[PDB]
Amino acid sequence: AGRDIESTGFAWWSGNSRLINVSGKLLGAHVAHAGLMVFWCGAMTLFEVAHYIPEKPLYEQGLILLPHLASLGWGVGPGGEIVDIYPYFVVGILHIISSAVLGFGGVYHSLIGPDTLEESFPAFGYDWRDKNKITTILGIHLVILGFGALLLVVKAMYLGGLYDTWAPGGGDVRIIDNPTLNPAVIIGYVLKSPWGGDGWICSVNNMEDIVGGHIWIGFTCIAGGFWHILTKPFAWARRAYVWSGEAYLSYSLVAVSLMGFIASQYSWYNNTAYPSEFYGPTGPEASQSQAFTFLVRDQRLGKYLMRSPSGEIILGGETQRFWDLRAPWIEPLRGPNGLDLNKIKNDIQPWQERRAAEYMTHAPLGSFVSPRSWLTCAHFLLGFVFYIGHLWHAGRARAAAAGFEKGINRENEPVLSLRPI
Amino acid sequence: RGWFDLADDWLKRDRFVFVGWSGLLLFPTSYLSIGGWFTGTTFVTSWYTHGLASSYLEGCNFFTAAVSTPANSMGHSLLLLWGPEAQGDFTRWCQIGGLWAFCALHGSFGLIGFCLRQFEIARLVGIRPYNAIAFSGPIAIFVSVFLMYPLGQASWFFAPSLGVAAIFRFLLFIQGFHNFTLNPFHMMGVAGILGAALLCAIHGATVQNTIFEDGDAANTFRAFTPTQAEETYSMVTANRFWSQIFGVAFSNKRWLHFFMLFVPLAGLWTSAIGIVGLALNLRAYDFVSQELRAAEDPEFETFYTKNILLNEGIRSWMAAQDQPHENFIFPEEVLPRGNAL
Amino acid sequence: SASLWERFCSWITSTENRLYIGWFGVLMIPTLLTATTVYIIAFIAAPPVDIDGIREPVAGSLLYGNNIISGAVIPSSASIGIHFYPIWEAASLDEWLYNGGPYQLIVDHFLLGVCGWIGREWEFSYRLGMRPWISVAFTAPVAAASAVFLVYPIGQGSFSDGMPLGISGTFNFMLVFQAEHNILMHPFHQLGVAGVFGGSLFSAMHGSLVTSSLIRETSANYGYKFHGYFGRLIFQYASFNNSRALHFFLGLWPVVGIWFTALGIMTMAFNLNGFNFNQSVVDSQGRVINTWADILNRANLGMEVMHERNA
């Protein structure tokens, strides 16, 4: 039967483990889960559009997908204001309709479709041990991911551009004419320190670097996909990895755990790919905005300034710890030495004051649960639990390869052959 | 046979729930204690004892509802329903906090009855009574915290109230007024509890990861039969593992299980000793040398002095509402603050 | 065997060394030993550290007037934040010591060492042919240590918010965390408390049941050579007849509890605080009727008003 513990050895609570050695049902399960993800995307987009109050900002209404759509430039004008929610509705409708097709495909390939694929469709079947076929599938999906990155690039440069907070006088939807294709900048971002003041890849602070890095990622993924399609793993790779479905699952698990940690840090710190007009200010941004508002109200009608550990002029107080913040409303007031007092006195703009006040009102770290807080906490928790899953599945893959995942052999216990210490 | 013999035979019958002679004390006392706690958290207020609302009827949830301790005007009174405080009036008895005394007394007798139940059942199955000696830990905890501590204090008012937020208040109140984290007996209790949790987790993982392959199924829970004379996991493999991973390992299963028994019990008894010490305000609140050093050196600061300042702030800012009977009125000028320092 | 590198591999991964080294032990041993010796040297002689960053150092060393209870390795200066602060990034050794650099050194090397310990537990489980999920159990205290040492400073933006490497420093960390975040009302710390209390209860219960039913083969421990009682104490249905399932539950419960409390600490690092039931009861006229949550909030406010130590 293959759907019970008697014929598989797996209980009901581990029942999807029965899908390891059957390909068609595994493909159906994956397509069904993809349909679930697309359905959630569309349904949540429709839910957020349906609860969107025009006067309130996006970050004050507990919305997380509408800021993602606004960062792409849809339905947003100058200054981060939302013009119309119709493109968001179209996105939600398209996802929620394609979810029906994906769910039908998953149900078909799971229930009535063939359990195994290689006997009927040899081009799609696999064994989890044929390294060439698994690398071919990996290369095809790598090409798909690279084309998705290039699609984002095309949206950035051709189809309406992307929202930029660093545009003068507040953010605006801008076409990225000249992305940074210089490999030195991208490599320095990848090889940057992750600690305070450097931030590794989270500290990318302009849209040109984002578009250039996505160009490099898309073309690199296409090249690597073609490579893995046309090549076989080398001798050093063959002897180092376990070649089974659970091992590949564990590799994907640790990869997505690291990605979840990176995304949580992106949502917490980055204000370029996560504009503060949509996601709200960051904690450092809120603290520095409160300090700057107090400084402005002191200049109108010095106190509020000190020197950084490297000697630059920064905002004084409990904010001192957040002197590494770079925000669009404070960059024109900062010079080579640091913030300049006369430039704040004279070259200040009303929109900067309004941004500082509105970010002071809504503080994640505290001056209201910020959407940045929700995203960061959720994806940090997901990264941790998926690191746990990677450890579990990698250990079990190693044990199953060696043949001792079901327990110790009484006939030949290894410890009994080892001499006592 | 004799009435006793027949009653003993009936109480010892193999039913779904063993009753026994100890049941005659356990079942009514425990049932009344639990029902009184539910009644207090559902209907009875704390407005006339603590100046608080603690009932579902008043709008509290599961966390904020509690059976609050009696008023500080009662002292260490038994608060009998027929006693001179209530004089048979159920409403006044509930208003003065007599339901807390009801729950505490009937619950102490229920704990005694459950310990006797463990003793009785151990004498019938024919096993050593290492239960009801493990339960002596929780018994000592309850006696020291809910009985001995208020008896050493002014009244039942300073005992823990039977509620979640009430227990959290009790924790912060004891920290503020006693610095109980600094108490070495509490430190031994924390070590015992954390070590017991460590032992539970590590022993479970060690047994699950050293099982013999006694079945062909990937799920290995079926490979254990109820009457198994052979051991289901390899003690030698587990010993070698920890001997070469941690440097030391258990070699005797008996000792290992006695140690897993001993650690939480010893921790609970040490914490009970610490709470008994707190009952008379005989607390390890401060280090005299550190206080003298801080007094003659304003630039000398350690985390202990910061803890002392935090405890002082806790006491000053919670005295007014936590002890409404004292009628504490503290002006903002005398309230400690970080800027005020 | 046939190669110098093969000989080196057969000695790093040998099951005959009194203590397994392994590849994870190749990273674990240097980091753990470095953190250990730096911690010992700092706990005895370290200079006082300006943790707040306002030029008022805090002493935590035995030689500067601390005892075992009050001694600690003070967290890094608030001026440092979460900037990487090794010895070579400081102008002088004195300023490195003054800004709490040894705290960062110990924390980083200790986190690397505990990750290596997880990997080494897996590695020796694989070398001995046993099941590998002891490291999964050990992930929970490692997660808690990383949350209190690394994740919380990252969320707050300064290593000065990390837990001090001491006893009184730990108590101060707990009190300040309760003041700022109200961790007692956080459901994940409640789950962690349930986990540790259940772990103690289940360890005591399992020890009592095994010791009670020891077969007479004899100290009774020399009787060992290298369910009915429980089902009558409570109703018959509540009993773990399967020993393997019982031990799986014993492993699972405290590990899940510590996982939940570490996740709670991580969430509160990004200001996902506990429940707030303050001013939940009012009368007809609108006056607030206090609850026990109000008393808890009063205690939290009393702690908070003396943490700022500034405006």
Binding site: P420 | G247, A249 | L62, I68
Partner: peptide, 30 residues
């Protein structure tokens, strides 16, 4: 001078751990 006592107690505990690890009773099958 109490610092000397504290250091002495800590190293004595560490030495006790060292001797417990590397000079334990060697387990054997009986």
């Amino acid at each position: 001078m109490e610092t000397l006592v504290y250091t002495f107690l800590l190293i004595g505990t560490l030495g006790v751990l060292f001797f417990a690890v590397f000079f334990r009773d060697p387990p054997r099958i009986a």
